CSV table of N, CA and C in Angstrom, one decimal:
chain,number,residue,atom,x,y,z
B,1037,UNK,N,177.7,111.4,112.8
B,1037,UNK,CA,178.2,110.3,113.7
B,1037,UNK,C,178.5,109.1,112.9
B,1038,UNK,N,179.7,108.4,113.1
B,1038,UNK,CA,180.1,107.2,112.5
B,1038,UNK,C,179.2,106.0,113.0
B,1039,UNK,N,178.7,106.1,114.2
B,1039,UNK,CA,177.7,105.1,114.7
B,1039,UNK,C,176.5,105.8,115.2
B,1040,UNK,N,175.3,105.1,115.1
B,1040,UNK,CA,174.0,105.7,115.4
B,1040,UNK,C,173.2,104.6,116.1
B,1041,UNK,N,172.8,104.9,117.4
B,1041,UNK,CA,171.9,104.0,118.2
B,1041,UNK,C,170.5,103.8,117.6
B,1042,UNK,N,170.2,102.6,117.3
B,1042,UNK,CA,168.8,102.2,116.7
B,1042,UNK,C,168.2,101.1,117.5
B,1043,UNK,N,166.9,101.2,117.7
B,1043,UNK,CA,166.0,100.1,118.2
B,1043,UNK,C,165.2,99.5,117.0
B,1044,UNK,N,165.6,98.4,116.5
B,1044,UNK,CA,165.0,97.8,115.3
B,1044,UNK,C,163.8,96.9,115.7
B,1045,UNK,N,162.6,97.1,115.1
B,1045,UNK,CA,161.5,96.2,115.4
B,1045,UNK,C,161.7,94.8,114.8
B,1046,UNK,N,161.5,93.8,115.6
B,1046,UNK,CA,161.8,92.4,115.1
B,1046,UNK,C,160.4,91.8,114.6
B,1047,UNK,N,160.4,91.5,113.3
B,1047,UNK,CA,159.2,91.1,112.6
B,1047,UNK,C,159.2,89.5,112.4
B,1048,UNK,N,158.0,88.9,112.5
B,1048,UNK,CA,157.9,87.4,112.1
B,1048,UNK,C,157.9,87.4,110.6
B,1049,UNK,N,158.6,86.4,110.0
B,1049,UNK,CA,158.9,86.3,108.5
B,1049,UNK,C,157.5,86.3,107.8
B,1050,UNK,N,156.5,85.7,108.3
B,1050,UNK,CA,155.2,85.5,107.6
B,1050,UNK,C,154.3,86.8,107.7
B,1051,UNK,N,154.7,87.8,108.5
B,1051,UNK,CA,154.0,89.1,108.6
B,1051,UNK,C,154.6,90.1,107.6
B,1052,UNK,N,155.9,89.9,107.2
B,1052,UNK,CA,156.6,90.8,106.3
B,1052,UNK,C,155.9,90.9,105.0
B,1053,UNK,N,155.5,92.2,104.6
B,1053,UNK,CA,154.8,92.6,103.4
B,1053,UNK,C,155.8,92.9,102.3
B,1054,UNK,N,157.0,93.5,102.6
B,1054,UNK,CA,158.0,93.8,101.5
B,1054,UNK,C,159.2,93.0,101.9
B,1055,UNK,N,159.7,92.1,101.1
B,1055,UNK,CA,160.5,91.0,101.5
B,1055,UNK,C,162.0,91.2,101.1
B,1056,UNK,N,162.3,92.4,100.6
B,1056,UNK,CA,163.7,92.8,100.4
B,1056,UNK,C,163.7,94.2,100.0
B,1057,UNK,N,164.9,94.8,99.8
B,1057,UNK,CA,165.1,96.2,99.6
B,1057,UNK,C,165.4,96.5,98.1
B,1058,UNK,N,165.5,95.5,97.2
B,1058,UNK,CA,165.8,95.7,95.8
B,1058,UNK,C,166.4,94.5,95.1
B,1059,UNK,N,167.1,94.8,94.1
B,1059,UNK,CA,167.4,93.9,93.0
B,1059,UNK,C,168.9,93.8,92.7
B,1060,UNK,N,169.7,94.7,93.2
B,1060,UNK,CA,171.2,94.6,93.2
B,1060,UNK,C,171.8,94.7,94.6
B,1061,UNK,N,173.0,94.1,94.8
B,1061,UNK,CA,173.7,94.2,96.1
B,1061,UNK,C,173.8,95.7,96.5
B,1062,UNK,N,174.2,96.5,95.5
B,1062,UNK,CA,174.4,97.9,95.8
B,1062,UNK,C,173.1,98.6,96.2
B,1063,UNK,N,172.0,98.2,95.5
B,1063,UNK,CA,170.7,98.8,95.8
B,1063,UNK,C,170.2,98.4,97.2
B,1064,UNK,N,170.3,97.1,97.6
B,1064,UNK,CA,169.7,96.6,98.9
B,1064,UNK,C,170.5,97.2,100.1
B,1065,UNK,N,171.8,97.3,100.0
B,1065,UNK,CA,172.7,98.1,100.9
B,1065,UNK,C,172.3,99.5,101.0
B,1066,UNK,N,172.0,100.2,99.8
B,1066,UNK,CA,171.6,101.6,99.7
B,1066,UNK,C,170.3,101.8,100.5
B,1067,UNK,N,169.3,101.0,100.1
B,1067,UNK,CA,167.9,101.1,100.6
B,1067,UNK,C,167.8,100.8,102.1
B,1068,UNK,N,168.6,99.7,102.4
B,1068,UNK,CA,168.7,99.3,103.8
B,1068,UNK,C,169.2,100.4,104.7
B,1069,UNK,N,170.3,101.1,104.3
B,1069,UNK,CA,170.9,102.2,105.0
B,1069,UNK,C,169.9,103.4,105.0
B,1070,UNK,N,169.2,103.7,103.9
B,1070,UNK,CA,168.2,104.8,103.9
B,1070,UNK,C,167.1,104.5,104.9
B,1071,UNK,N,166.5,103.3,104.9
B,1071,UNK,CA,165.4,102.9,105.8
B,1071,UNK,C,165.9,102.9,107.2
B,1072,UNK,N,167.1,102.5,107.5
B,1072,UNK,CA,167.6,102.5,108.9
B,1072,UNK,C,167.6,104.0,109.4
B,1073,UNK,N,168.2,104.9,108.6
B,1073,UNK,CA,168.2,106.3,108.9
B,1073,UNK,C,166.8,106.8,109.1
B,1074,UNK,N,165.8,106.4,108.2
B,1074,UNK,CA,164.4,106.9,108.3
B,1074,UNK,C,163.5,106.2,109.3
B,1075,UNK,N,164.1,105.2,110.0
B,1075,UNK,CA,163.3,104.4,111.0
B,1075,UNK,C,162.2,103.6,110.4
B,1076,UNK,N,162.4,103.1,109.2
B,1076,UNK,CA,161.4,102.3,108.4
B,1076,UNK,C,162.0,100.9,108.1
B,1077,UNK,N,162.9,100.4,109.0
B,1077,UNK,CA,163.7,99.2,108.7
B,1077,UNK,C,163.3,98.2,109.8
B,1078,UNK,N,163.0,97.0,109.4
B,1078,UNK,CA,162.8,95.9,110.4
B,1078,UNK,C,163.9,94.8,110.3
B,1079,UNK,N,163.8,93.9,111.3
B,1079,UNK,CA,164.8,92.8,111.5
B,1079,UNK,C,164.0,91.5,111.6
B,1080,UNK,N,164.4,90.6,110.7
B,1080,UNK,CA,163.8,89.2,110.8
B,1080,UNK,C,164.9,88.3,111.3
B,1081,UNK,N,164.7,87.7,112.4
B,1081,UNK,CA,165.7,86.8,113.0
B,1081,UNK,C,165.9,85.6,112.1
B,1082,UNK,N,167.1,85.2,111.7
B,1082,UNK,CA,167.3,84.1,110.8
B,1082,UNK,C,167.2,82.7,111.5
B,1083,UNK,N,166.3,81.9,111.0
B,1083,UNK,CA,166.1,80.5,111.5
B,1083,UNK,C,165.9,79.7,110.2
B,1084,UNK,N,165.9,78.3,110.4
B,1084,UNK,CA,165.7,77.3,109.3
B,1084,UNK,C,164.4,77.7,108.6
B,1085,UNK,N,164.4,78.1,107.3
B,1085,UNK,CA,163.3,78.3,106.4
B,1085,UNK,C,162.8,79.7,106.3
B,1086,UNK,N,163.5,80.6,107.0
B,1086,UNK,CA,163.3,82.1,106.9
B,1086,UNK,C,163.8,82.7,105.6
B,1087,UNK,N,165.1,82.5,105.3
B,1087,UNK,CA,165.8,83.1,104.1
B,1087,UNK,C,165.1,82.8,102.8
B,1088,UNK,N,164.6,81.5,102.6
B,1088,UNK,CA,164.0,81.2,101.3
B,1088,UNK,C,162.6,81.9,101.2
B,1089,UNK,N,162.1,82.4,102.3
B,1089,UNK,CA,160.8,83.2,102.3
B,1089,UNK,C,161.0,84.7,102.1
B,1090,UNK,N,162.3,85.1,102.1
B,1090,UNK,CA,162.6,86.5,101.7
B,1090,UNK,C,163.2,86.5,100.3
B,1091,UNK,N,163.5,87.7,99.8
B,1091,UNK,CA,164.0,88.0,98.4
B,1091,UNK,C,165.5,88.4,98.5
B,1092,UNK,N,166.3,87.7,97.7
B,1092,UNK,CA,167.7,88.1,97.4
B,1092,UNK,C,167.7,89.4,96.5
B,1093,UNK,N,168.8,90.2,96.6
B,1093,UNK,CA,169.9,90.0,97.6
B,1093,UNK,C,169.4,90.3,99.0
B,1094,UNK,N,170.0,89.6,100.0
B,1094,UNK,CA,169.7,89.8,101.4
B,1094,UNK,C,170.5,90.9,102.0
B,1095,UNK,N,170.0,91.6,103.0
B,1095,UNK,CA,170.9,92.5,103.8
B,1095,UNK,C,170.9,91.9,105.2
B,1096,UNK,N,172.1,91.5,105.7
B,1096,UNK,CA,172.3,91.1,107.1
B,1096,UNK,C,172.8,92.3,108.0
B,1097,UNK,N,172.5,92.4,109.2
B,1097,UNK,CA,173.3,93.0,110.3
B,1097,UNK,C,174.2,92.0,111.0
B,1098,UNK,N,175.5,92.2,111.1
B,1098,UNK,CA,176.4,91.3,111.7
B,1098,UNK,C,177.2,92.1,112.8
B,1099,UNK,N,177.5,91.4,113.9
B,1099,UNK,CA,178.2,91.9,115.1
B,1099,UNK,C,179.6,92.3,114.6
B,1100,UNK,N,180.0,93.6,114.8
B,1100,UNK,CA,181.3,94.1,114.3
B,1100,UNK,C,182.3,94.3,115.5
B,1101,UNK,N,181.9,93.8,116.7
B,1101,UNK,CA,182.6,94.1,118.0
B,1101,UNK,C,181.9,93.4,119.1
B,1102,UNK,N,182.6,93.0,120.2
B,1102,UNK,CA,182.1,92.5,121.5
B,1102,UNK,C,182.1,93.5,122.6
B,1103,UNK,N,179.5,96.6,123.5
B,1103,UNK,CA,178.1,96.9,123.3
B,1103,UNK,C,177.7,98.1,124.1
B,1104,UNK,N,177.9,99.3,123.6
B,1104,UNK,CA,177.6,100.6,124.3
B,1104,UNK,C,176.2,100.7,124.7
B,1105,UNK,N,175.9,101.0,125.9
B,1105,UNK,CA,174.5,101.3,126.4
B,1105,UNK,C,173.5,100.1,126.1
B,1106,UNK,N,174.0,98.9,126.0
B,1106,UNK,CA,173.3,97.7,125.6
B,1106,UNK,C,173.0,97.5,124.1
B,1107,UNK,N,173.5,98.5,123.3
B,1107,UNK,CA,173.4,98.4,121.8
B,1107,UNK,C,174.5,97.6,121.3
B,1108,UNK,N,174.2,96.5,120.7
B,1108,UNK,CA,175.3,95.6,119.9
B,1108,UNK,C,175.7,96.4,118.7
B,1109,UNK,N,177.0,96.5,118.5
B,1109,UNK,CA,177.7,97.2,117.4
B,1109,UNK,C,177.6,96.2,116.2
B,1110,UNK,N,177.2,96.8,115.0
B,1110,UNK,CA,176.8,95.9,113.8
B,1110,UNK,C,177.2,96.7,112.6
B,1111,UNK,N,177.4,96.0,111.5
B,1111,UNK,CA,177.5,96.6,110.1
B,1111,UNK,C,176.8,95.7,109.1
B,1112,UNK,N,176.5,96.3,108.0
B,1112,UNK,CA,175.7,95.6,106.9
B,1112,UNK,C,176.6,94.8,106.0
B,1113,UNK,N,176.1,93.6,105.7
B,1113,UNK,CA,176.7,92.6,104.7
B,1113,UNK,C,175.5,92.1,103.8
B,1114,UNK,N,175.6,92.3,102.5
B,1114,UNK,CA,174.7,91.7,101.5
B,1114,UNK,C,175.1,90.3,101.1
B,1115,UNK,N,174.2,89.5,100.6
B,1115,UNK,CA,174.4,88.2,100.1
B,1115,UNK,C,173.5,88.0,98.8
B,1116,UNK,N,174.2,87.5,97.7
B,1116,UNK,CA,173.4,87.2,96.5
B,1116,UNK,C,174.1,85.9,95.9
B,1117,UNK,N,173.2,84.9,95.7
B,1117,UNK,CA,173.5,83.5,95.2
B,1117,UNK,C,174.7,83.0,96.0
B,1118,UNK,N,174.8,83.2,97.3
B,1118,UNK,CA,175.8,82.6,98.3
B,1118,UNK,C,177.1,83.3,98.3
B,1119,UNK,N,177.2,84.5,97.6
B,1119,UNK,CA,178.4,85.4,97.7
B,1119,UNK,C,178.1,86.6,98.6
B,1120,UNK,N,178.8,86.8,99.7
B,1120,UNK,CA,178.6,87.9,100.7
B,1120,UNK,C,179.5,89.1,100.3
B,1121,UNK,N,179.0,90.3,100.4
B,1121,UNK,CA,179.8,91.5,100.1
B,1121,UNK,C,179.9,92.3,101.3
B,1122,UNK,N,181.1,92.2,101.9
B,1122,UNK,CA,181.4,92.5,103.3
B,1122,UNK,C,181.8,91.3,104.1
B,1123,UNK,N,182.4,91.6,105.3
B,1123,UNK,CA,183.1,90.6,106.2
B,1123,UNK,C,182.8,91.1,107.6
B,1124,UNK,N,182.1,90.4,108.4
B,1124,UNK,CA,181.8,90.8,109.8
B,1124,UNK,C,181.5,89.5,110.6
B,1125,UNK,N,181.1,89.7,111.9
B,1125,UNK,CA,180.9,88.6,112.8
B,1125,UNK,C,179.5,88.0,112.7
B,1126,UNK,N,178.9,87.6,113.8
B,1126,UNK,CA,177.6,86.8,113.8
B,1126,UNK,C,176.4,87.6,113.3
B,1127,UNK,N,175.6,87.0,112.5
B,1127,UNK,CA,174.3,87.5,112.0
B,1127,UNK,C,173.4,87.7,113.2
B,1128,UNK,N,172.9,88.9,113.4
B,1128,UNK,CA,171.8,89.3,114.3
B,1128,UNK,C,170.4,89.1,113.6
B,1129,UNK,N,170.4,89.2,112.3
B,1129,UNK,CA,169.3,88.8,111.4
B,1129,UNK,C,169.3,89.6,110.1
B,1130,UNK,N,168.3,89.4,109.3
B,1130,UNK,CA,168.2,90.0,107.9
B,1130,UNK,C,167.3,91.2,108.0
B,1131,UNK,N,167.7,92.3,107.3
B,1131,UNK,CA,166.9,93.5,107.3
B,1131,UNK,C,165.9,93.5,106.2
B,1132,UNK,N,164.7,94.1,106.5
B,1132,UNK,CA,163.6,94.3,105.6
B,1132,UNK,C,162.9,95.6,105.8
B,1133,UNK,N,162.3,96.2,104.8
B,1133,UNK,CA,161.4,97.3,105.0
B,1133,UNK,C,160.4,97.0,106.1
B,1134,UNK,N,160.1,98.1,106.9
B,1134,UNK,CA,159.0,98.1,107.9
B,1134,UNK,C,157.9,99.0,107.3
B,1135,UNK,N,156.7,98.4,107.2
B,1135,UNK,CA,155.5,99.2,106.6
B,1135,UNK,C,154.3,99.0,107.6
B,1136,UNK,N,154.6,99.1,108.9
B,1136,UNK,CA,153.6,99.0,110.0
B,1136,UNK,C,153.3,97.6,110.5
B,1137,UNK,N,154.1,96.6,110.2
B,1137,UNK,CA,153.9,95.3,110.8
B,1137,UNK,C,154.1,95.4,112.3
B,1138,UNK,N,153.3,94.6,113.1
B,1138,UNK,CA,153.5,94.6,114.6
B,1138,UNK,C,154.7,93.7,114.9
B,1139,UNK,N,155.8,94.3,115.6
B,1139,UNK,CA,157.0,93.6,116.0
B,1139,UNK,C,156.7,92.6,117.2
B,1140,UNK,N,157.6,91.7,117.4
B,1140,UNK,CA,157.5,90.7,118.5
B,1140,UNK,C,158.4,91.2,119.6
B,1141,UNK,N,159.4,92.0,119.3
B,1141,UNK,CA,160.6,92.4,120.1
B,1141,UNK,C,161.4,93.5,119.4
B,1142,UNK,N,162.2,94.2,120.1
B,1142,UNK,CA,163.1,95.3,119.6
B,1142,UNK,C,164.6,94.8,119.8
B,1143,UNK,N,165.4,94.9,118.8
B,1143,UNK,CA,166.9,94.6,118.9
B,1143,UNK,C,167.6,96.0,118.9
B,1144,UNK,N,168.2,96.3,120.1
B,1144,UNK,CA,169.0,97.5,120.3
B,1144,UNK,C,170.4,97.4,119.6
B,1145,UNK,N,170.7,98.3,118.6
B,1145,UNK,CA,172.0,98.1,117.9
B,1145,UNK,C,172.7,99.5,117.7
B,1146,UNK,N,174.0,99.5,117.6
B,1146,UNK,CA,174.8,100.6,117.2
B,1146,UNK,C,175.3,100.3,115.8
B,1147,UNK,N,174.7,101.0,114.8
B,1147,UNK,CA,175.0,100.8,113.4
B,1147,UNK,C,176.2,101.7,113.0
B,1148,UNK,N,177.3,101.0,112.5
B,1148,UNK,CA,178.4,101.7,111.8
B,1148,UNK,C,177.7,102.3,110.5
B,1149,UNK,N,177.6,103.6,110.4
B,1149,UNK,CA,177.0,104.3,109.2
B,1149,UNK,C,178.2,105.0,108.5
């Protein structure tokens, strides 16, 4: 399938134990996509002072369309030193590894894979 319905657990930034997916733009996109497939991926909602508490490069999910079965359609954009790799709509938040943190909420998404 080109798109896959996912329920992403929404983590508070100060609970996140692994604060990024790697060390290159290509690696963080790669790892982000792998964790999404394996259901080991969390979402940190972006607010003032969140991003400097996580590790670059960042992986964002961004709205790719205006929502089948309540799932917002999204695609991955990485950012390193203020340069984005990818072009999409509004940030739903930054992706992080999930290692059993307790979520505050779930974000229903349709991921372009």
